Scaffold this active site. Structure first.
Site, short mmCIF file in Angstrom:
data_model
loop_
_atom_site.label_atom_id
_atom_site.label_comp_id
_atom_site.label_asym_id
_atom_site.label_seq_id
_atom_site.Cartn_x
_atom_site.Cartn_y
_atom_site.Cartn_z
N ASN A 17 6.62 -1.77 -6.88
CA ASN A 17 5.61 -1.73 -7.93
C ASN A 17 6.24 -1.83 -9.31
OD1 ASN A 17 3.95 -1.38 -5.77
ND2 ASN A 17 3.39 0.73 -6.27
N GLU B 203 -2.67 -21.35 -22.10
CA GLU B 203 -1.54 -22.27 -21.97
C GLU B 203 -0.97 -22.27 -20.56
OE1 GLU B 203 1.52 -21.90 -24.83
OE2 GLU B 203 0.20 -21.58 -26.54
N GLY C 252 -10.36 -5.85 3.25
CA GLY C 252 -11.39 -4.85 3.03
C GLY C 252 -11.45 -4.35 1.60
N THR C 253 -10.83 -3.18 1.37
CA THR C 253 -10.74 -2.63 0.02
C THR C 253 -9.92 -3.54 -0.90
OG1 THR C 253 -10.70 -0.50 1.16
CG2 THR C 253 -10.35 -0.49 -1.21
N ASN D 147 6.42 -8.44 0.24
CA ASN D 147 7.11 -7.16 0.36
C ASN D 147 8.49 -7.32 1.00
OD1 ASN D 147 5.07 -5.59 -0.82
ND2 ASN D 147 3.96 -5.42 1.12
N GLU E 153 -11.69 4.02 -0.78
CA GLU E 153 -11.34 5.33 -0.28
C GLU E 153 -10.93 6.25 -1.43
OE1 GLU E 153 -9.21 2.73 0.84
OE2 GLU E 153 -7.33 3.18 -0.20
N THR F 52 1.59 -4.57 7.77
CA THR F 52 0.99 -3.32 8.22
C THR F 52 -0.10 -3.57 9.26
OG1 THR F 52 1.52 -2.09 6.21
CG2 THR F 52 -0.37 -1.34 7.50
N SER G 269 -4.05 -6.82 -2.78
CA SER G 269 -3.32 -7.24 -1.60
C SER G 269 -4.24 -8.05 -0.70
CB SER G 269 -2.77 -6.05 -0.82
OG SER G 269 -3.82 -5.30 -0.23
N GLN H 218 -5.68 -0.37 -2.36
CA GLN H 218 -4.61 0.62 -2.42
C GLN H 218 -3.37 0.06 -3.10
OE1 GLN H 218 -2.80 3.84 0.24
NE2 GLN H 218 -2.62 2.00 1.50
N1 LIG Z 1 4.08 -4.12 -2.67
C1 LIG Z 1 3.22 -3.20 -2.27
N2 LIG Z 1 2.37 -3.46 -1.22
C2 LIG Z 1 1.49 -2.52 -0.80
C3 LIG Z 1 1.43 -1.29 -1.43
N3 LIG Z 1 0.47 -0.56 -0.82
C4 LIG Z 1 -0.07 -1.29 0.17
N4 LIG Z 1 0.55 -2.51 0.20
C5 LIG Z 1 0.25 -3.62 1.12
O1 LIG Z 1 -1.13 -3.64 1.42
C6 LIG Z 1 -1.34 -4.04 2.76
C7 LIG Z 1 -2.58 -3.38 3.36
O2 LIG Z 1 -3.56 -3.10 2.38
P1 LIG Z 1 -3.62 -1.62 1.74
O3 LIG Z 1 -3.15 -1.66 0.32
O4 LIG Z 1 -2.79 -0.68 2.57
O5 LIG Z 1 -5.16 -1.16 1.80
P2 LIG Z 1 -6.30 -1.95 1.00
O6 LIG Z 1 -5.74 -3.22 0.41
O7 LIG Z 1 -6.84 -1.05 -0.08
O8 LIG Z 1 -7.43 -2.26 2.09
P3 LIG Z 1 -7.97 -1.10 3.07
O9 LIG Z 1 -7.01 -0.92 4.22
O10 LIG Z 1 -9.33 -1.47 3.60
O11 LIG Z 1 -8.06 0.18 2.28
C8 LIG Z 1 -0.09 -3.62 3.50
O12 LIG Z 1 0.29 -4.63 4.41
C9 LIG Z 1 0.98 -3.45 2.44
O13 LIG Z 1 1.96 -4.45 2.58
C10 LIG Z 1 2.28 -1.02 -2.49
O14 LIG Z 1 2.23 0.07 -3.05
N5 LIG Z 1 3.17 -1.98 -2.91
MG LIG Z 2 -6.98 1.73 1.33
#
Ligand SMILES: Nc1nc2c(ncn2[C@@H]2O[C@H](COP(=O)(O)OP(=O)(O)OP(=O)(O)O)[C@@H](O)[C@H]2O)c(=O)[nH]1
Ligand SMILES: [Mg+2]
Ligand SMILES: Nc1nc2c(ncn2[C@@H]2O[C@H](COP(=O)(O)OP(=O)(O)OP(=O)(O)O)[C@@H](O)[C@H]2O)c(=O)[nH]1
Ligand SMILES: Nc1nc2c(ncn2[C@@H]2O[C@H](COP(=O)(O)OP(=O)(O)O)[C@@H](O)[C@H]2O)c(=O)[nH]1
Ligand SMILES: [Mg+2]
Lengths: 431, 437, 284, 118, 437
Positions: free
Chosen positions: B228, B254, B144-145, B206, B71, B179, B140, B11
């Site tokens: 972002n 490099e 998982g994802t 973050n 997802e 989170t 991130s 995500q």
């Molecule tokens: N800087 C930044 N961090 C994000 C953003 N979206 C999610 N995160 C970080 O991602 C962490 C959790 O992972 P997610 O991106 O919500 O979900 P995922 O990485 O796809 O993994 P899943 O939960 O299984 O779907 C959170 O602790 C957020 O700090 C974003 O748009 N910008």
């Molecule tokens: Mg997700």
């Protein structure tokens, strides 16, 4: 395309389910005739999660309606937003539950389970990516308790991978409405604790307290008490239906909220709540919402978390707000009442943000809490159970409808062991 | 020609890549419809887009990106928005259910049903290339994802390809805010196994970007979109040398040879300047020396980790704009004469200087001002060992009584992987200690 | 302990008055934008139940273009044989639909289904127009026996609804007493289903009377053509109406012991009597 | 009596989703806009809610006023077009089962092509 | 930024605040429903309301007021009047039983079950407030809620907040006019317990406003409405420096540090001047010297005591409207050259002067007339000791044979507190004569 099959068994389950379908039908723009009269195209993109496409623009809810009487089920079919349900999934009996777990679990309810399971099987293989099942029951009656728990057991046996949500109206220290609530509660929680993925224990006493203190509301009846439960059920599953910057579905909530498998009893909440005289004087903002979430008087369970200790907290914010504000608000509260959190889990808060807020509110938030303080409820139920069972009070109905006292003893011992687990995971320090 | 492939997984990766490709389209003058606005003329001389965009016939520029998400939530917004007619429909690879913050679910069960498809799409986007430089992998450490599927993807990518560089942009957790609750589990089990198959992994935090937005941009309540956009500015400052001409350019080949002393310490920190807003940029003088000192200020690092408690090992100077190397060298000398910024005894040298002629772009409805020059730290130092120590402390606090382990175990993941991950992070801490001393 | 009226300033009166104010605000919103059920029902009563002038015949025969009213005589044995069910009273074929197409668009819009109301009063919901079907038939010509026609409503409120039937197939049948359905349609899917004919009373002079002009105020038989079924009141059970409880008209050739059409098969065409064009015309 | 029963039933039915839970307004139409729609899909302002790009200073809050995170886009709700596509499908469904269709697959598929198709 | 919290205690305080908030609504141009109808697009910002009005969600400005009373029908008149949808219903805190002109009943039994609720509402308003300046407490020294509950409020507010300013806009009993019979008891028991928990106690006499409204505003039959409107004009003139911008300005701390010489001497008499009807106003040429001599006139004081039998310590000198600083300075020079006005020898310089450019808004349907200039005088004269001594004489007359004491004793109050209040007021008056001599 994650799919939730909603089920409700019993009078109270049918009432709160009808309110849930009203609160989600006016969210998704579904009219009482079933068609789609909304115009925002963000609504008609995840409508499959709770509804099923029919001919025309009609959408039939994916709900299984169970009751052992042709009473309040006909009432919810004849009430508002009752013309949307298919008539096939109105399986009901022509008997009485008797407020009897044995009658609901080993007799005439049990020969309705064939039709109920056929309907559930059809609605489950009509999907493609079924997330799970969501049963809302009564836990103190005979249709909600016995038939609901046996349906939970059968569905868990058939699909032991999907997510099992159970919204249970657990009995209160105060009020009454049934003398054998301790029996119908112990004998049902004995199967809930081993067959349910997550359980939300709502309490009518706490709902009446909320109606007293945050909504004034001299004559709220069951309509408002069911409306709060409907709002909570809509706010838990909102990330499946609407987009957001930080989504969290039911499996994300279960993974982030349940440390040990027999520790899935929560206290839900909903906190853009204020009285009608203060609705236009209260400013919807993240600190105010978070304060009302973490206030102990807004729990929908009668357990007071200040006498216990929070193991894990989940927070789902519907609306458009700022993630730094949300994250620093939870950092602030977790720093402030740090004695109310377990030491062996750092960052005891799981955050979710959904873009679309509910009707009327620009910004709403729901709260899910796994804590030690829910053990006072099971201790109370154990005390009442061992008060009645010591003298075989009202036991001849249960043992002559066809059971044994060993089931009663097993339920009491299992729920006392659950109490012991909750107590041991409270004051155990890290190092 | 200097082609590169961006895989945005998770995500956070999808949102960051959304902002990144918005910035790339604005930089190269490509409309959201994927077409040039037909008043460019030129005559094909401005080929400074082929590193990120192809050219499919009549002028439709298809980006060299793979958007992966288990997802169907944040990729459907891309599929339905104004960027719908920019991406190839199966470059927006979509799952059916999310991995539920679960390393095991993202690595074994839900990971091993879409990994063949994403490797097929990466293979197609890679053999539709003429000199691919590397893979920018945006994810991130949430789990998982994100971290899990990125781990499986890079495990397959290292086997499939060879010496191609795989740069990681990883959202590292903050010391305080996060989170998920199983965040330490996901981070430890991901930094155990992506530490061997990566090349250079930038950490972005973050809470650090929140403090940057509060102090410098003066936005008290930023959303993820501002973060972002700042990350997109970081990546654009990294890859501007592959697109626009400059006084001296730096490449991804490099880059690792300048910031990775030993293969286990490939964990740099990113910093940007100036991130001042439009209401103060036109009043504050913005030149090379004070933007370099702003970068080397401890309250500017985008990791939430003070470099004052560690020794700098290597640094990547990235200037873009009307920047002269004499003022670059003067600023570097004023940095090196400061006693607060402490280098390490085995590296008397080291400031990899790149200078690009293209000024930084601005996005409509954005945050940063129109500045004529900017600078990026990409620094490798011993400060991040404190973050590793905090992460391992959190992991041991959760794992001391087997909290949340049953999900991983019953999802099809053996329990000894947690112990071997903790061994690997302990070895990483010890390696950082012996490098620092 | 004791509770008072919210006008009395003793208890929860402030937010009780606030709640009453909010309910009154909502009520005035529905009143000003016209979604109150009282206003919808009153508009229905005013627009539907309006007297309509009938056509007065000169020679006593039914002519094309006449408005006329389809009525049915009461039971011959009005004496209560058994206490309970009332014998079938004199009733008029009418147009029905349930709630929503009554509440909005103000008119008979689409597929309706018919009924038999006990109100022996000419009205928009129960007057019609006899119309040709084969074209080339001059208006004001006699309808006669064995000659096909179409029973359509007025071109005002109603939108020229045409009578139609169907089979006893398992997708469209009467709501009670599973049989052929009698509907009013606006689109006219197929022309043969929207077509009716009139047969004489005595089933021996029928073949000789095919071609003779039809008289108005005596008993005749409404036969479909496509299914060869005759109109029936079908008493003993009723369908729901916003204007009361009405009988359920069904196409069914009901036959007695001597294979002849029963009491509910003999409908009568009622014109306007030659004193004023409203009311009924009396049988003969 | 047959009146107190209905009165008690409608009293126990209980309020409304606008008499309860609704703050300030009672409309869902204006809040059906997403962050992606108001950030990456441009979605320019109209009417009174046109935020200036100046972002001047306030003394009553000691911070700059026009927070884009506090004043989101108001106006038309988020639309993609699949509502219109599904509406075309529903009109096709209503144009189906029209009794007198009697149309074969050969007649639907093999028709007279336009002149420019040759 | 700068906000004040107004607490209206008792029937007198609630009615004074009823006139007050009407005047503030008219001054800041808000309708009784709480809306700003201006909406001037290019202008119409007008951030001056963020001193006494708090911005809620739907464009509604709520006052920072707590209307607290132990007895209904007056806050019920507020709740049922035209200012219904302006106040927060949780800021209209009411009890069930009055104190019934009994200080013991308002301070010891009935005030205990409601002081916690009013403190919670004060804490909520302070938490919403960013940069609080002080409290404005409107009550009467006559008796009941305005004595015991007001003293209890000062005790708990001095316990909680501490350094914040607490101004007491008290209503003081007249030399001859007295409604209650136990007014000397309640007044002295209020003075003893609020002598150390206050910062400036502006008492106001009803007889003086009666004389002012009859002589100046040519009204034969004035009611409490005119008195409360004049006190509203007093408090608006005091807080106009905080609300509106202008010339040399004062806040509450600037105000009190120049008017309280000694810690026990915080009792400045108030005076207002424009007090002219329309007929007398149009045949007048109100100028700075004329209206300054109008304030220094002994027939314009709001407390019935002539300042000739006393010496001025300090005067805070609030000009408001079409005011020129050298006209102010020439006026103050003329009064200092006047021999009859006597200042104290240890205060050679005694004028805390402050000018605002926002002339007062007269309430339509009122008694005053629109003017271009206004003066507020707040003078700490050594003449209020005569009032203190006359109430001391009244208390001695009542307490000589213990009249009306059995109510206090059977309610739960000792005679030792009566004796302590008597000794404290004797100490206060001998302190006044010692400092004045
Ligand atoms: N800087 C930044 N961090 C994000 C953003 N979206 C999610 N995160 C970080 O991602 C962490 C959790 O992972 P997610 O991106 O919500 O979900 P995922 O990485 O796809 O993994 P899943 O939960 O299984 O779907 C959170 O602790 C957020 O700090 C974003 O748009 N910008
Ligand atoms: Mg997700
Ligand atoms: N200036 C002014 N003074 C008032 C007004 N109403 C009452 N008072 C004063 O109040 C005194 C009487 O005591 P109250 O203040 O009414 O008593 P309370 O504070 O309401 O407490 P209770 O004894 O419970 O009624 C009188 O001496 C008046 O001088 C008013 O409207 N304006
Ligand atoms: N919140 C809520 N609780 C209800 C409702 N109806 C019943 N209950 C509660 O459910 C308990 C009895 O369960 P019951 O409905 O009789 O179970 P059943 O007989 O199996 O359907 C009582 O203690 C009630 O407090 C309802 O509509 N809403
Ligand atoms: Mg009073």
């Amino acid at each position: 395309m994650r799919e939730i099959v909603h089920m409700q068994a019993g009078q109270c389950g049918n009432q709160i389910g009808a309110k849930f379908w009203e609160v989600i039908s006016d969210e998704h723009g579904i009219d009482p005739t079933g068609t789609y009269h909304g115009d925002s195209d963000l609504q008609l993109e995840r409508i499959n999660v709770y509804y099923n496409e029919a001919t025309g623009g009609k959408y039939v809810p994916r709900a299984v309606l169970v009751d052992l009487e042709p009473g309040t089920m006909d009432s919810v079919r004849s009430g508002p937003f009752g013309q949307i349900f298919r008539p096939d999934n109105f399986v009901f009996g022509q008997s009485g539950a008797g407020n009897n777990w044995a009658k609901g679990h080993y007799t005439e309810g049990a020969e309705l389970v064939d039709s109920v399971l056929d309907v559930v099987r059809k609605e489950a293989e009509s999907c493609d990516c079924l997330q799970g099942f969501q049963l809302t029951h009564s836990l103190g009656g005979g249709t909600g308790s016995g038939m609901g728990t046996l349906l939970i057991s059968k569905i868990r046996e058939e699909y032991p991978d999907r997510i099992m949500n159970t919204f249970s109206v657990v009995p209160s220290p105060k009020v009454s409405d049934t003398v054998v609530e301790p029996y119908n509660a112990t004998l049902s929680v004995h199967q809930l604790v081993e067959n349910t993925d997550e359980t939300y224990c709502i309490d009518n006493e706490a709902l009446y307290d909320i109606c007293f203190r945050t909504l004034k509301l001299t004559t709220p009846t069951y309509g408002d008490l069911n409306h709060l439960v409907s709002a909570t059920m809509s706010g838990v599953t909102t990330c499946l239906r609407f987009p957001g910057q930080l989504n969290a579905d039911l499996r994300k909530l279960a993974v982030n909220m349940v440390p040990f498998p027999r520790l899935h009893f929560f206290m839900p909440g909903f906190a853009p709540l204020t009285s009608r005289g203060s609705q236009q004087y209260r400013a919807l903002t993240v600190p105010e919402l978070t304060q009302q979430m973490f206030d102990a008087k807004n729990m929908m369970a009668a357990c007071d978390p200040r006498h216990g200790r929070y193991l894990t907290v989940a927070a789902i914010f519907r609306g458009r707000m700022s993630m730094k504000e949300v994250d620093e608000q939870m950092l602030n509260v977790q720093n402030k009442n740090s004695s109310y959190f377990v030491e062996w889990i750092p960052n005891n808060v799981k955050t979710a943000v959904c873009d679309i807020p509910p009707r009327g509110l620009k910004m709403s938030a729901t709260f899910i809490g796994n804590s030690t303080a829910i053990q006072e409820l099971f201790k109370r139920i154990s005390e009442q159970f061992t008060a009645m069972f010591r003298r075989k009070a009202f036991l001849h109905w249960y043992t002559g409808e066809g059971m044994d006292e060993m089931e009663f003893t097993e339920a009491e011992s299992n729920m006392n062991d659950l109490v012991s687990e909750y107590q041991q995971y409270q004051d155990a320090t890290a190092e | 020609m200097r082609e590169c492939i961006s895989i945005h997984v998770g995500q956070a990766g999808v949102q960051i890549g959304n902002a990144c490709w918005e910035l790339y389209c604005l930089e190269h003058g490509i409309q959201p419809d994927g077409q040039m606005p037909s008043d460019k003329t030129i005559g094909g001389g401005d080929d400074s887009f082929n590193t990120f965009f192809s050219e499919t016939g009549a002028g439709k520029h298809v980006p060299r990106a793979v958007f992966v998400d288990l997802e169907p939530t944040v990729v459907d917004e891309v599929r339905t928005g104004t960027y719908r007619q920019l991406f190839h429909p199966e470059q927006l690879i979509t799952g059916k259910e999310d991995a539920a913050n679960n390393y095991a679910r993202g690595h074994y069960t839900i990971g091993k049903e879409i990994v063949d498809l994403v490797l097929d799409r990466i293979r197609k986007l890679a053999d539709q290339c003429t000199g691919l430089q590397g893979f920018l992998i945006f994810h991130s450490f949430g789990g998982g994802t994100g971290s899990g599927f990125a781990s499986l993807l890079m495990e397959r990518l290292s086997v499939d390809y060879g010496k191609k560089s795989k740069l990681e942009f990883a959202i590292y957790p903050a010391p305080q805010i996060s989170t998920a609750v199983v965040e330490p589990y996901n981070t430890i089990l991901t930094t155990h196994t992506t530490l061997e198959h990566s090349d250079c992994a930038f950490m972005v935090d973050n809470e650090a970007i929140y403090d940057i937005c509060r102090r410098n941009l003066d936005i008290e309540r930023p959303t993820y979109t501002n973060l972002n956009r700042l990350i997109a500015q970081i990546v654009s400052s990294i890859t501007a040398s592959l697109r626009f001409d400059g006084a001296l350019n730096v490449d991804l080949t490099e880059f690792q040879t300048n910031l990775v002393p030993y293969p286990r310490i490939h964990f740099p920190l990113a910093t940007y300047a100036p991130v001042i807003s439009a209401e103060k940029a036109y009043h504050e003088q913005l030149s090379v020396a004070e933007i370099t000192n702003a970068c080397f200020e401890p309250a500017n690092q985008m990791v939430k980790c003070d470099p004052r408690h560690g020794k700098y090992m290597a640094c990547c100077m990235l200037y873009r704009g009307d920047v002269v190397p004499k003022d670059v060298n003067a600023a570097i000398a004023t940095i090196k004469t400061k006693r607060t910024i402490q280098f390490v005894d085995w590296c008397p040298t080291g400031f990899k200087v790149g200078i690009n002629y293209q000024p930084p772009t601005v996005v409509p409805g954005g945050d940063l001002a129109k500045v004529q020059r900017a600078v990026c730290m990409l620094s490798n130092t011993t400060a991040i060992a404190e973050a590793w120590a905090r992460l391992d402390h959190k992991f041991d606090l959760m794992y001391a009584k087997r909290a949340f382990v049953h999900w991983y175990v019953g999802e099809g993941m053996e329990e000894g992987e947690f112990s071997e991950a903790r061994e690997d992070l302990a070895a990483l801490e010890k390696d950082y200690e012996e490098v620092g001393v | 302990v004791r509770s008072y009226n919210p006008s009395v300033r003793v208890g929860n009166w402030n937010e009780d008055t606030c709640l009453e104010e909010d309910m009154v605000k909502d009520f005035l919103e529905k009143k000003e934008k016209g979604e109150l059920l009282i206003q919808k029902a009153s508009n229905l009563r005013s627009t539907i139940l309006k007297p309509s002038d009938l056509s007065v015949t000169v020679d006593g025969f039914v002519h094309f273009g006449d408005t006329v009213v389809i009525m049915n005589e009461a039971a011959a044995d009005q004496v209560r044989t058994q206490p309970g069910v009332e014998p079938r009273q004199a009733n008029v074929l009418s147009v029905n639909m349930s709630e929503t197409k009554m509440h909005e668009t103000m008119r008979f819009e689409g597929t309706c289904t018919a009924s038999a109301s006990k109100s022996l009063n000419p009205c928009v919901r129960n007057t019609f127009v006899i119309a040709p079907a084969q074209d080339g038939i001059p208006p004001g010509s006699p309808l006669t026996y064995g000659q096909h026609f179409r029973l359509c409503t007025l071109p005002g409120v109603g939108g020229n609804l045409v009578l139609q039937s169907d089979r006893v197939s398992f997708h469209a049948s009467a709501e009670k007493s599973r049989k052929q359905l009698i509907s009013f349609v606006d689109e006219v899917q197929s022309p043969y289903l929207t077509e009716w004919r009139i047969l004489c009373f005595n089933p021996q002079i029928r073949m000789e009377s095919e071609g003779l002009p039809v008289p108005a105020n005596q008993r005749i038989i409404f036969n479909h053509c496509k299914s060869n079924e005759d109109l029936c009141v079908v008493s003993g059970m009723s369908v729901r109406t916003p204007f009361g409880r009405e009988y359920e008209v069904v196409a069914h050739t009901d036959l007695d012991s001597h294979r002849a059409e029963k009491d509910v098969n003999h409908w009568i065409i009622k014109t306007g009597e030659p004193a004023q064009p409203t009311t009924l015309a009396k049988t003969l | 009596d047959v009146m107190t029963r209905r009165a008690a039933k409608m009293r126990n039915e209980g309020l409304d989703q606008t008499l309860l839970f609704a703050h300030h307004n009672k409309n869902l139409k204006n809040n059906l806009i997403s962050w992606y729609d108001e950030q990456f899909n441009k979605r320019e302002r109209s009417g009174g809610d046109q935020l200036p790009e100046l972002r001047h200073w306030d003394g009553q809050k000691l911070a700059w006023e026009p927070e884009k995170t506090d004043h989101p886009v108001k106006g038309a709700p988020t639309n993609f077009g699949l509502k219109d596509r599904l509406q075309e499908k529903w009109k096709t469904e209503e144009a189906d089962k029209k009794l007198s269709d009697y149309s074969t697959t050969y007649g639907l598929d093999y028709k007279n092509k336009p002149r420019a198709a040759l």
